[PDB]
Design an enzyme around this catalytic site. Structure first.
Site, PDB file in Angstrom:
ATOM      1  N   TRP A  22       7.586  -0.019   3.165  1.00 47.66           N
ATOM      2  CA  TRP A  22       8.258   0.682   1.810  1.00 47.66           C
ATOM      3  C   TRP A  22       9.571   1.009   1.565  1.00 47.66           C
ATOM      4  N   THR A  29       9.130  27.425   2.109  1.00 49.04           N
ATOM      5  CA  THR A  29       7.712  27.060   2.157  1.00 49.04           C
ATOM      6  C   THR A  29       6.783  27.941   2.769  1.00 49.04           C
ATOM      7  N   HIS A  37       0.973  -1.222  -0.087  1.00 55.43           N
ATOM      8  CA  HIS A  37      -0.150   0.157  -0.206  1.00 55.43           C
ATOM      9  C   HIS A  37       1.049   1.146  -0.024  1.00 55.43           C
ATOM     10  N   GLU A  44      12.829  12.501  -2.860  1.00 49.13           N
ATOM     11  CA  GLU A  44      11.771  11.906  -3.561  1.00 49.13           C
ATOM     12  C   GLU A  44      10.311  12.533  -2.893  1.00 49.13           C
ATOM     13  N   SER A  80      11.617   4.743 -15.655  1.00 50.98           N
ATOM     14  CA  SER A  80      10.367   5.396 -15.901  1.00 50.98           C
ATOM     15  C   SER A  80      10.618   6.810 -15.695  1.00 50.98           C
ATOM     16  N   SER A  81      10.986   7.089 -14.303  1.00 47.16           N
ATOM     17  CA  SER A  81      11.013   8.396 -13.846  1.00 47.16           C
ATOM     18  C   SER A  81      12.381   9.218 -14.559  1.00 47.16           C
ATOM     19  N   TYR A 108       9.685  15.626  -2.024  1.00 47.10           N
ATOM     20  CA  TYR A 108       9.651  17.056  -2.547  1.00 47.10           C
ATOM     21  C   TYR A 108       9.708  16.961  -4.303  1.00 47.10           C
ATOM     22  N   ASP A 164       5.351  19.705 -29.804  1.00 46.72           N
ATOM     23  CA  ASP A 164       5.339  18.289 -29.315  1.00 46.72           C
ATOM     24  C   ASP A 164       6.474  18.223 -28.387  1.00 46.72           C
ATOM     25  N   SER A 171      -0.934  27.132  -7.755  1.00 47.46           N
ATOM     26  CA  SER A 171      -0.487  28.655  -8.152  1.00 47.46           C
ATOM     27  C   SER A 171      -1.362  28.902  -9.326  1.00 47.46           C
ATOM     28  N   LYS A 183       6.069  30.749   0.131  1.00 46.54           N
ATOM     29  CA  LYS A 183       5.231  30.291  -0.812  1.00 46.54           C
ATOM     30  C   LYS A 183       3.655  30.302  -0.480  1.00 46.54           C
ATOM     31  N   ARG A 188       4.502   2.343  15.090  1.00 46.73           N
ATOM     32  CA  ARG A 188       4.169   2.059  13.760  1.00 46.73           C
ATOM     33  C   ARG A 188       3.859   0.691  13.425  1.00 46.73           C
ATOM     34  N   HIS A 215      14.508  11.429   0.702  1.00 49.88           N
ATOM     35  CA  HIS A 215      14.147  12.805   1.136  1.00 49.88           C
ATOM     36  C   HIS A 215      13.938  13.503  -0.050  1.00 49.88           C
ATOM     37  N   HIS A 256      17.555  12.811   8.805  1.00 53.68           N
ATOM     38  CA  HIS A 256      16.604  13.325   9.567  1.00 53.68           C
ATOM     39  C   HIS A 256      15.715  12.026   9.862  1.00 53.68           C
ATOM     40  N   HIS A 257      15.808  11.047   9.110  1.00 52.90           N
ATOM     41  CA  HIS A 257      15.203   9.617   9.301  1.00 52.90           C
ATOM     42  C   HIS A 257      16.084   8.795   9.692  1.00 52.90           C
TER      43      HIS A 257
HETATM   44  C1  HEA Z   1       0.391   9.132  -1.428  1.00 54.80           C
HETATM   45  C2  HEA Z   1       0.567   8.690  -0.349  1.00 54.80           C
HETATM   46  C3  HEA Z   1      -0.621   7.802   0.492  1.00 54.80           C
HETATM   47  C4  HEA Z   1      -1.900   8.261   0.555  1.00 54.80           C
HETATM   48  C5  HEA Z   1      -2.940   9.313  -0.302  1.00 54.80           C
HETATM   49  C6  HEA Z   1      -2.452   7.245   1.534  1.00 54.80           C
HETATM   50  C7  HEA Z   1      -3.848   7.170   2.096  1.00 54.80           C
HETATM   51  C8  HEA Z   1      -4.280   6.534   3.317  1.00 54.80           C
HETATM   52  N1  HEA Z   1      -3.546   5.978   3.761  1.00 54.80           N
HETATM   53 FE1  HEA Z   1      -1.491   5.457   3.988  1.00 54.80          FE
HETATM   54  N2  HEA Z   1       0.634   5.209   3.900  1.00 54.80           N
HETATM   55  C9  HEA Z   1       1.575   5.714   2.943  1.00 54.80           C
HETATM   56  C10 HEA Z   1       0.937   6.843   1.919  1.00 54.80           C
HETATM   57  C11 HEA Z   1      -0.328   7.065   1.637  1.00 54.80           C
HETATM   58  N3  HEA Z   1      -1.363   6.853   2.435  1.00 54.80           N
HETATM   59  C12 HEA Z   1       2.838   5.287   2.925  1.00 54.80           C
HETATM   60  C13 HEA Z   1       3.870   5.808   2.372  1.00 54.80           C
HETATM   61  C14 HEA Z   1       2.757   4.390   4.173  1.00 54.80           C
HETATM   62  C15 HEA Z   1       3.939   3.577   4.974  1.00 54.80           C
HETATM   63  C16 HEA Z   1       3.666   2.172   4.665  1.00 54.80           C
HETATM   64  C17 HEA Z   1       4.945   1.568   4.977  1.00 54.80           C
HETATM   65  O1  HEA Z   1       5.374   1.933   6.445  1.00 54.80           O
HETATM   66  O2  HEA Z   1       5.757   0.395   4.793  1.00 54.80           O
HETATM   67  C18 HEA Z   1       1.223   4.440   4.377  1.00 54.80           C
HETATM   68  C19 HEA Z   1       0.871   3.584   5.521  1.00 54.80           C
HETATM   69  C20 HEA Z   1      -0.644   3.610   6.070  1.00 54.80           C
HETATM   70  C21 HEA Z   1      -0.782   3.443   7.646  1.00 54.80           C
HETATM   71  C22 HEA Z   1       0.075   3.140   8.738  1.00 54.80           C
HETATM   72  C23 HEA Z   1       0.067   1.660   8.760  1.00 54.80           C
HETATM   73  C24 HEA Z   1       0.931   1.081   9.761  1.00 54.80           C
HETATM   74  O3  HEA Z   1       1.857   1.906  10.148  1.00 54.80           O
HETATM   75  O4  HEA Z   1       0.938  -0.120  10.167  1.00 54.80           O
HETATM   76  C25 HEA Z   1      -2.234   3.961   7.698  1.00 54.80           C
HETATM   77  C26 HEA Z   1      -2.887   3.865   9.143  1.00 54.80           C
HETATM   78  O5  HEA Z   1      -4.210   4.197   9.065  1.00 54.80           O
HETATM   79  C27 HEA Z   1      -2.829   4.313   6.270  1.00 54.80           C
HETATM   80  C28 HEA Z   1      -4.234   4.702   6.052  1.00 54.80           C
HETATM   81  C29 HEA Z   1      -4.641   5.469   4.831  1.00 54.80           C
HETATM   82  C30 HEA Z   1      -5.866   5.935   4.844  1.00 54.80           C
HETATM   83  C31 HEA Z   1      -7.003   5.497   5.752  1.00 54.80           C
HETATM   84  C32 HEA Z   1      -5.718   6.638   3.533  1.00 54.80           C
HETATM   85  C33 HEA Z   1      -6.947   7.281   2.817  1.00 54.80           C
HETATM   86  O6  HEA Z   1      -6.614   8.657   2.598  1.00 54.80           O
HETATM   87  C34 HEA Z   1      -7.665   6.504   1.684  1.00 54.80           C
HETATM   88  C35 HEA Z   1      -7.064   7.306   0.299  1.00 54.80           C
HETATM   89  C36 HEA Z   1      -7.902   8.171  -0.098  1.00 54.80           C
HETATM   90  C37 HEA Z   1      -7.900   8.837  -1.257  1.00 54.80           C
HETATM   91  C38 HEA Z   1      -8.820  10.070  -1.669  1.00 54.80           C
HETATM   92  C39 HEA Z   1      -6.434   9.088  -1.801  1.00 54.80           C
HETATM   93  C40 HEA Z   1      -6.336   8.254  -3.224  1.00 54.80           C
HETATM   94  C41 HEA Z   1      -6.505   9.298  -4.017  1.00 54.80           C
HETATM   95  C42 HEA Z   1      -6.855   9.100  -5.447  1.00 54.80           C
HETATM   96  C43 HEA Z   1      -7.874   8.194  -5.597  1.00 54.80           C
HETATM   97  C44 HEA Z   1      -6.711  10.336  -6.409  1.00 54.80           C
HETATM   98  C45 HEA Z   1      -6.133   9.619  -7.822  1.00 54.80           C
HETATM   99  C46 HEA Z   1      -7.308  10.260  -8.818  1.00 54.80           C
HETATM  100  C47 HEA Z   1      -7.048  10.529  -9.912  1.00 54.80           C
HETATM  101  C48 HEA Z   1      -5.767  10.565 -10.617  1.00 54.80           C
HETATM  102  C49 HEA Z   1      -7.943  10.975 -11.024  1.00 54.80           C
HETATM  103  N4  HEA Z   1      -1.672   4.074   5.392  1.00 54.80           N
HETATM  104  C1  HEA Z   2       4.673  15.276   0.596  1.00 49.77           C
HETATM  105  C2  HEA Z   2       5.639  14.684   1.118  1.00 49.77           C
HETATM  106  C3  HEA Z   2       6.481  15.258   2.231  1.00 49.77           C
HETATM  107  C4  HEA Z   2       6.705  16.719   2.512  1.00 49.77           C
HETATM  108  C5  HEA Z   2       6.495  17.968   1.610  1.00 49.77           C
HETATM  109  C6  HEA Z   2       7.613  16.625   3.909  1.00 49.77           C
HETATM  110  C7  HEA Z   2       7.795  17.795   4.332  1.00 49.77           C
HETATM  111  C8  HEA Z   2       8.664  18.046   5.722  1.00 49.77           C
HETATM  112  N1  HEA Z   2       9.182  16.773   6.319  1.00 49.77           N
HETATM  113 FE1  HEA Z   2       8.536  14.852   6.306  1.00 49.77          FE
HETATM  114  N2  HEA Z   2       8.155  13.062   5.875  1.00 49.77           N
HETATM  115  C9  HEA Z   2       7.394  12.425   4.829  1.00 49.77           C
HETATM  116  C10 HEA Z   2       6.870  13.317   3.536  1.00 49.77           C
HETATM  117  C11 HEA Z   2       7.124  14.647   3.381  1.00 49.77           C
HETATM  118  N3  HEA Z   2       7.601  15.468   4.267  1.00 49.77           N
HETATM  119  C12 HEA Z   2       7.279  10.978   4.747  1.00 49.77           C
HETATM  120  C13 HEA Z   2       6.758   9.906   3.575  1.00 49.77           C
HETATM  121  C14 HEA Z   2       7.844  10.523   6.087  1.00 49.77           C
HETATM  122  C15 HEA Z   2       8.077   9.198   6.624  1.00 49.77           C
HETATM  123  C16 HEA Z   2       9.013   8.374   5.931  1.00 49.77           C
HETATM  124  C17 HEA Z   2       8.984   6.883   6.299  1.00 49.77           C
HETATM  125  O1  HEA Z   2       8.228   6.287   5.548  1.00 49.77           O
HETATM  126  O2  HEA Z   2       9.505   6.545   7.119  1.00 49.77           O
HETATM  127  C18 HEA Z   2       8.425  11.727   6.372  1.00 49.77           C
HETATM  128  C19 HEA Z   2       9.122  12.022   7.697  1.00 49.77           C
HETATM  129  C20 HEA Z   2       9.737  13.334   8.239  1.00 49.77           C
HETATM  130  C21 HEA Z   2      10.896  13.288   9.190  1.00 49.77           C
HETATM  131  C22 HEA Z   2      11.547  11.934   9.629  1.00 49.77           C
HETATM  132  C23 HEA Z   2      11.227  11.707  11.024  1.00 49.77           C
HETATM  133  C24 HEA Z   2      10.899  10.273  11.412  1.00 49.77           C
HETATM  134  O3  HEA Z   2      10.095   9.423  10.745  1.00 49.77           O
HETATM  135  O4  HEA Z   2      11.220   9.961  12.413  1.00 49.77           O
HETATM  136  C25 HEA Z   2      11.109  14.343   9.488  1.00 49.77           C
HETATM  137  C26 HEA Z   2      12.468  14.911  10.131  1.00 49.77           C
HETATM  138  O5  HEA Z   2      13.049  16.149  10.084  1.00 49.77           O
HETATM  139  C27 HEA Z   2      10.530  15.186   8.353  1.00 49.77           C
HETATM  140  C28 HEA Z   2      10.175  16.648   8.559  1.00 49.77           C
HETATM  141  C29 HEA Z   2       9.716  17.510   7.553  1.00 49.77           C
HETATM  142  C30 HEA Z   2      10.159  18.956   7.350  1.00 49.77           C
HETATM  143  C31 HEA Z   2      10.775  20.069   8.251  1.00 49.77           C
HETATM  144  C32 HEA Z   2       9.304  19.291   5.965  1.00 49.77           C
HETATM  145  C33 HEA Z   2       9.082  20.805   5.616  1.00 49.77           C
HETATM  146  O6  HEA Z   2       9.489  20.722   4.113  1.00 49.77           O
HETATM  147  C34 HEA Z   2       7.818  21.306   5.894  1.00 49.77           C
HETATM  148  C35 HEA Z   2       7.960  22.659   5.703  1.00 49.77           C
HETATM  149  C36 HEA Z   2       6.667  23.604   6.027  1.00 49.77           C
HETATM  150  C37 HEA Z   2       6.224  24.273   6.988  1.00 49.77           C
HETATM  151  C38 HEA Z   2       7.189  24.333   7.988  1.00 49.77           C
HETATM  152  C39 HEA Z   2       4.836  24.978   6.972  1.00 49.77           C
HETATM  153  C40 HEA Z   2       4.767  26.011   6.284  1.00 49.77           C
HETATM  154  C41 HEA Z   2       5.781  27.288   6.707  1.00 49.77           C
HETATM  155  C42 HEA Z   2       5.350  28.288   7.392  1.00 49.77           C
HETATM  156  C43 HEA Z   2       3.806  28.571   7.595  1.00 49.77           C
HETATM  157  C44 HEA Z   2       6.190  29.338   8.022  1.00 49.77           C
HETATM  158  C45 HEA Z   2       6.282  29.335   9.431  1.00 49.77           C
HETATM  159  C46 HEA Z   2       6.834  28.233  10.015  1.00 49.77           C
HETATM  160  C47 HEA Z   2       7.875  28.488  11.084  1.00 49.77           C
HETATM  161  C48 HEA Z   2       7.996  29.708  11.635  1.00 49.77           C
HETATM  162  C49 HEA Z   2       8.638  27.207  11.527  1.00 49.77           C
HETATM  163  N4  HEA Z   2       9.085  14.467   7.869  1.00 49.77           N
HETATM  164 CU   LIG Z   3      12.423  13.734   5.108  1.00 52.47          CU
END
Ligand code: HEA
Ligand code: HEA
Ligand SMILES: [Cu+2]
Ligand SMILES: [Mg+2]
Lengths: 91, 74, 504, 78, 72, 51, 266, 47, 90
Positions: free
Chosen positions: C125, C310, C60, C237, C153-154, C239, C90, C250, C313, C432, C235, C284-285
């Protein structure tokens, strides 16, 4: 005779005969600096190849000959490995 | 009553402390080779590695020493 | 034949969008099992099978990260919209654009086929060794080969995008007149090219450990090196998946506010600063793996600097809505909902960036709540904002407005009441990747499982929004895709449009 | 591509700081205690203790006075 | 003819409706004309239903498959 | 061999779990730490491990 | 057909200098060939019967589709479909592909640097491990360095020359010097006193040098395919320049590989 | 007057390279995919 | 015309004209079809771009405020200026 490449040819001019030969000589100086000597030593190495021998057996240390799974996908010994050198007796 | 454990070695500053274990285990057998068997420093090294090293690691190291696969000089 | 042999970017983008919808359906289905097992303490519908639960969460997570968001944003909207937006007739390499798509159904088939083989790939994952090495059989190899094909692909798509931007621009149009969607897609392509091959190298090392008895991550190797390489990929990925969402937000915000974007050069410098800082904060992971305190010190101090661009933005989006003439439709709500709910996910990231605080909440559901805020409110809202905005241009069908607001409200209710209690679970210490928990965690898990059903019902209602479209004649616009008919011709921009600077 | 806005230099100060910190961190690791491919490095206990204590003190000695003063928070919570 | 380099390079000069299309997608004003497919809304709903059924039933089959293997 | 320096302020019974995915039974590896006073520890508990 | 060229001139060629392709079947076949070869590779890892045969069957299908695709690209390059801007697009695409491959090599050499500098207690903290005899730098690797530098200079000759005979001779010299690099690497792989299962030293050495040698082979095949097109018409266009750039990239990669593994003992 | 039988890009070779391979390889990949699916699913690993 | 230095030779100039389109003297935009999309910038802000559609046989048309007026003309060939008239260099 009406190709696209000829149609757009006057709009993409070439960036401007003996200067080419001067550049060829300049690069061939560096070519002949390392060219013949490397070929000569490699042709010497092709004739002093699989004739020497090593009889240094290696003790079966834990970091030697890792077998986390049994064997290899092709056979028992390593690929390109005519003569294993790690002790299979150990003593 | 007071309990005695391995002291802090300044030579090993990181959180991973496997090298401290290994160096103390090797200093024990170096002491055993050089300064007899009943010297106080050798007992200090022995209690120092016993306080740090897991028992599985130590027994693997004596089976490597008994098989002849120990790279130490002594 | 048409959909199998295509060289048009508009057919390939639509194929990406349909594929991403299929992947979203699969990940919605895999996520109702996660929430239906976790609803009550004890053993649910999985009959206490923990390996099957690990397989379900691994598949998932991989599916929703790589076969839903990237094929929708980067492959779906980018391929359809980039040449029309910059005026290119194109793509630069039209047949490379078709193999960039057609390596995705093989990777999805390999990933779905690894679940039916042996006991499946229950690793997460991230697929950490030695748990990934210890798995005996074929499933993990099929999963890693699926990741390899998706990475290829990417990389191919990013190469085609980067050459299409640099060399097929309209005459007179410099790197100042392209919309922010184009800038976001170009920066995403640069990130993909710099980041994906490190993952490919780490996965080749994983296969050589599994099957060739090599010494990369093993008894005599170093297992922290895998986490270094994987998170150096991973990380960037996250972004990669959020920058096209910024571009779509935008374009949507600027459209219905009847205003241009506030601070265009600041927006571009902020996206560039986000792209550059994403490559020096990967560890930070890895706060709990035993790194030295100086390394943890640097990776703590450098992670929080990502907050500043951010925030710039978000404040510029608010300034774009400010002093405009705003009309609120369904894409405008999905953008307002994006800006509101991405901020909630971003501020928890600042908390997680601090290492001492991260010693308490690492591998808890706090992290899960953080990344489901920044991905289900950040990327899914951005995807659905573009579906209602450009949908009559892309598909040729309009949408009923009332049912789309019903779908938006059902989704907004469902995903807020799902991941907000997971903050309280993660603060209390619920870990988790577990299917059974302590007795005291029952209430918030019941609330979150109630919310997931609302999210599923919202997914169901979305299929009812489509209806017949009305077609009119365009005269003027601020971007090139709104002076075209709906749908455009097969060769859109039959004559190449030029940009004329005003004289004196 | 354009004129760098007055924001972009204020962005570039901590970005330059983070890049310099990253370079210094990567550079100081091959001048650390556990990056030695020999067992005979540790048999000189004076030099090894001096090197490892120097690896401890740098970038931590800036924080010793506030570690002793428990300046672990922005506010003062007792 | 039929295998010359010009057939490879400029394609085949087909004009009009292709085989079973009711509209010219290659040279007409719209590359997608969903109001001219006969019985379009039946086919669209059947295809969306099939996509929903497969996308929601593949993980259920994978759960049933793995649990039928243990229960033996 | 990762080292932790720890000092406990008060007596009690503290709970925990394992926090890294490790297989089918990852949920079922809990941690319990019992804290007692040092004089009890050095006069009664360590007498259980003298051979 | 006779009006298809007329239609292309009237609607695409005379309006912009960019190339528009007809529909093609090779990307779909290449994708499903990757699927078949991945199933075969998974079966071949775990010693299933008829698994290596399936993997070779899939790889042969991929290679055949790639050759057919590249023949179509060369046919389109010979009917004059590619203007100068299209050729610059080809060079920019090769630059992007080269950057991707360079990051792959950086990830590969990261592991070598990490494993070599801090030997673990499992190796009894000695690098290189006892029993492993390292390959020196004062021997056949130095001959490879001289040969591959000569190949760099000979490919640099062919880029600036205008006489067709000199260009063909320089291309043949660089191809022949590349083939001498591989046949000498085969001898290193056979005479070496360690295998791929002998320590992280053996693992890192063989994986890194195998990837570099496979890139040497692919660059030599690319230069060979560029020479035969120059043999027929005395005009290569983007095929010559992109291949020379790729060969220079391989020569640059060898510098890092040699300096890290052979000199640095990592 | 610019094509020989030794030439790889001969127009007389286009049927074999482009039309025959498009169906031969199309059926070979179907046959290989079905066998590979059955082999990985219903096969036993000996290593 | 404007200075043709640092201009690509295939850009079809008229976009490089020295004329401000007025109501009584517009800029004639050549076209191979009966309609054509062009792009005009805002005279007070370079970053703002407006795309519009010109039609054949229509009155002069302005796209941005205080901007030029434009008339489409249907032609068989559009001068790819950079080698069409500066090679003439009349
Ligand atoms: C894109 C990233 C994404 C999205 C959308 C979701 C969506 C949801 N996820 Fe999850 N989830 C992950 C990324 C995501 N997740 C990741 C990375 C893990 C880690 C697995 C691991 O640890 O190995 C995780 C694991 C994870 C956990 C933790 C499991 C665990 O630790 O044991 C849970 C717990 O509740 C959860 C629940 C849900 C639920 C209820 C939704 C709901 O939002 C259901 C989805 C509903 C939607 C609306 C989104 C679907 C989007 C579309 C259908 C748009 C596409 C349409 C067009 C292109 C036209 N998922
Ligand atoms: C859409 C994907 C996405 C994005 C955009 C981000 C954005 C950020 N993430 Fe995250 N992150 C994940 C997806 C993402 N992350 C996933 C999937 C995991 C778990 C991986 C796994 O499966 O293990 C993860 C886990 C993760 C960790 C690892 C922690 C852990 O798992 O133990 C950390 C640690 O630093 C982190 C921090 C941040 C920070 C600082 C940003 C910043 O970019 C966000 C900055 C934005 C703001 C701060 C808000 C806007 C700012 C303002 C309004 C200004 C005012 C703010 C201040 C004055 C502070 N996230
Ligand atoms: Cu990160
Ligand atoms: Mg963890």
């Amino acid at each position: 005779g009406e190709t696209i490449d000829k149609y757009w040819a006057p709009y993409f001019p070439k960036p401007a005969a003996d200067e080419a030969k001067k550049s060829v000589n300049k690069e061939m100086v560096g070519f002949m600096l390392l060219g013949p000597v490397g070929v000569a030593f490699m042709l010497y190495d092709f004739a002093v190849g699989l004739e020497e021998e090593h009889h240094v057996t290696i003790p079966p240390y834990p970091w030697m000959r890792i077998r986390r799974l049994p064997g290899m996908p092709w056979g028992q010994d390593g690929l390109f490995e005519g003569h294993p050198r790690v002790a299979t007796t150990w003593p | 009553p007071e309990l005695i454990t391995a002291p802090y070695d300044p030579r090993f500053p990181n959180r991973n402390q496997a090298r401290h274990c290994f160096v103390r285990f090797n200093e024990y057998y170096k002491c055993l080779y050089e300064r007899g068997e009943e010297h106080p420093r050798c007992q200090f090294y022995q209690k120092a590695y016993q306080s740090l090293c897991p028992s599985e690691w130590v027994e693997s190291w004596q089976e490597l020493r008994e098989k002849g696969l120990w790279t130490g000089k002594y | 034949m048409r959909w199998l042999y295509s060289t048009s970017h508009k057919d390939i983008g639509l194929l990406y969008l349909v594929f991403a919808f299929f992947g979203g359906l699969l990940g919605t289905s895999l996520s109702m099992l996660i929430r239906y097992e976790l609803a009550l303490p004890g053993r649910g519908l999985l009959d206490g099978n923990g390996q099957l639960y690990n397989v379900i969460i691994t598949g998932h997570g991989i599916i929703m990260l790589l076969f839903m968001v990237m094929p929708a944003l980067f492959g779906g909207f980018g391929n359809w919209l980039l040449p029309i937006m910059i005026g290119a007739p194109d793509m630069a390499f039209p047949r490379l654009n078709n193999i960039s798509f057609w390596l995705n159904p093989p990777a999805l088939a390999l990933l779905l086929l690894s679940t039916l083989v042996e006991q499946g790939p229950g690793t997460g994952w991230t697929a950490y060794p030695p748990l990934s090495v210890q798995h005996s059989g074929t499933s993990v190899d099929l999963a890693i080969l699926s990741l390899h094909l998706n990475g290829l692909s990417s990389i191919l798509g990013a190469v085609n995008m980067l050459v299409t931007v640099a060399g097929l621009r309209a005459p007179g149009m410099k790197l100042l007149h392209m919309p922010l969607f184009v800038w976001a897609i170009a920066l995403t392509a640069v990130l993909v090219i710099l980041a994906v091959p490190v993952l490919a190298a780490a996965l080749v090392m994983l296969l050589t450990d599994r099957n060739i008895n090599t010494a990369y991550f093993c008894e005599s190797g170093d297992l922290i090196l895998y986490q270094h390489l994987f998170w150096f990929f991973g990380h960037p990925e996250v972004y990669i998946l959020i920058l096209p969402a910024f571009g779509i937000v935008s374009q949507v915000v600027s459209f219905f506010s009847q205003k241009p974007v506030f601070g265009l050069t600041g927006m571009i410098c902020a996206m560039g600063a986000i792209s550059l800082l994403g490559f020096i904060v990967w560890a930070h992971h890895m706060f709990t793996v035993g790194l030295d305190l100086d390394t943890v010190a640097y990776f703590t101090s450098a992670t929080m600097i990502i907050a500043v661009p951010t925030g710039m933005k978000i404040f510029s989006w608010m300034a774009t809505i400010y002093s405009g003439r705003v009309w609120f439709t369904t894409p405008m709500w999905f953008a307002v909902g994006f800006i509101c709910l991405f901020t909630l996910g971003g501020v928890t990231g600042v908390v997680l960036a601090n290492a001492g605080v991260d010693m308490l909440v690492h591998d808890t559901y706090y992290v899960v709540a953080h990344f489901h805020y920044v991905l289900s409110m950040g990327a899914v809202f951005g995807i659905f904002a573009g579906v209602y905005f450009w949908g009559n241009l892309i598909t040729g069908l309009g949408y009923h407005e009332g049912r789309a607001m019903v779908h938006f409200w059902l989704l907004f209710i469902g995903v807020n009441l799902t991941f907000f209690p997971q903050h309280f679970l993660g603060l209390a210490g619920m870990p988790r990747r577990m299917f059974d928990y302590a007795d005291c965690f029952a209430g918030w898990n019941a609330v979150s499982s109630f919310g997931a059903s609302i999210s599923f019902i919202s997914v169901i209602v979305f299929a009812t929004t489509f209806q017949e479209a009305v077609r009119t004649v365009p005269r003027t616009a601020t971007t090139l895709e709104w002076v075209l008919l709906a749908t455009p011709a097969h060769h859109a921009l039959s004559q190449v449009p030029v940009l004329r600077t005003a004289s004196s | 591509p354009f004129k760098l806005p007055l924001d972009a230099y204020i962005l570039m100060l901590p970005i330059t700081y983070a890049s310099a910190a990253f370079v210094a961190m990567c550079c100081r690791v091959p001048t650390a205690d556990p990056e030695t491919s020999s067992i005979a490095y540790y048999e000189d206990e004076q030099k090894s203790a001096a090197a490892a204590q120097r690896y401890d003190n740098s970038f931590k000695q800036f924080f010793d006075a506030r570690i002793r003063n428990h300046k672990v928070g922005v506010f003062q919570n007792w | 003819e039929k295998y010359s380099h010009e057939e490879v390079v400029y394609g085949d000069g087909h004009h009009g409706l292709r085989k079973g299309y009711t509209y010219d997608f290659e040279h007409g004003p719209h590359y997608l004309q969903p109001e001219k497919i006969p019985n379009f809304w039946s086919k669209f709903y059947a295809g969306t239903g099939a996509l929903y059924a497969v996308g929601l039933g593949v993980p259920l089959f994978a759960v049933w498959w793995q649990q039928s293997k243990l229960k033996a | 061999l990762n080292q932790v320096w720890m000092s406990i302020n008060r007596e009690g019974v503290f709970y925990g779990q394992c926090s890294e995915l490790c297989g089918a039974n990852h949920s079922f590896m809990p941690i319990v730490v019992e804290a007692i006073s040092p004089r009890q520890f050095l006069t009664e508990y360590v007498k259980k491990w003298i051979s | 057909h006779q009006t298809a060229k007329e239609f292309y001139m009237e609607h695409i060629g005379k309006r912009h200098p960019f190339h528009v392709l007809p529909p093609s079947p090779w990307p779909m076949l290449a994708g499903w060939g990757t699927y078949v070869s991945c199933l075969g590779m998974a079966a071949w890892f775990h010693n299933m019967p008829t698994g290596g045969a399936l993997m070779a069957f899939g790889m042969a299908n991929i290679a055949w589709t790639a050759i057919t695709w590249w023949r179509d690209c060369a046919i389109e390059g010979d009917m004059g479909m590619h203007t100068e801007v299209v050729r610059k697009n080809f060079i920019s695409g090769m630059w992007a592909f080269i950057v991707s491959e360079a990051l792959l090599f950086v990830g590969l050499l990261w592991a070598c640097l990490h494993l070599g500098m801090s030997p673990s207690v499992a190796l009894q903290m000695q690098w290189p491990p006892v029993g492993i005899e390292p390959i020196g730098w004062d021997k056949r690797a130095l001959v490879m360095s001289a040969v591959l530098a000569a190949s760099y200079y000979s490919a640099n000759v062919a880029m600036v020359a205008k006489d067709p005979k000199v260009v063909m001779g320089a291309l043949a010299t660089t191809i022949g010097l590349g083939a001498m690099f591989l046949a000498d690497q085969y001898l290193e792989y056979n005479e070496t006193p360690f295998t791929i299962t002998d320590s992280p030293y053996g693992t890192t050495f063989f994986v890194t040098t195998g990837f570099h040698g496979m890139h040497v082979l692919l660059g030599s095949l690319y230069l060979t395919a560029a020479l035969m097109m120059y043999k027929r018409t005395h005009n290569a266009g983007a095929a010559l320049k992109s291949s020379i750039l790729y060969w220079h990239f391989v020569d640059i990669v060898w510098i890092a590989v040699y300096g890290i593994i052979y000199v640095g003992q990592y | 007057d610019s094509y020989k039988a030794t030439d790889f890009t001969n127009p007389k070779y286009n049927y074999f390279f482009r039309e025959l391979t498009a169906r031969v390889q199309g059926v070979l990949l179907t046959g290989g995919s079905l066998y590979g699916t059955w082999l990985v699913v219903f096969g036993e690993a000996q290593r | 015309y404007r200075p043709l230095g640092d201009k690509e030779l295939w850009h079809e100039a008229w976009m490089y004209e020295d004329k401000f389109g007025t109501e009584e003297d517009p800029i004639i935009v050549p076209s191979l079809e009966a309609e054509r999309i062009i792009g005009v910038t805002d005279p007070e802000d370079e970053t703002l771009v407006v795309w519009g559609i010109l039609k054949d046989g229509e009155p002069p048309r302005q796209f941005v405020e205080n901007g030029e007026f434009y008339v489409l003309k249907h032609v068989e060939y559009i001068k790819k200026v950079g080698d069409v008239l500066e090679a003439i260099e009349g």
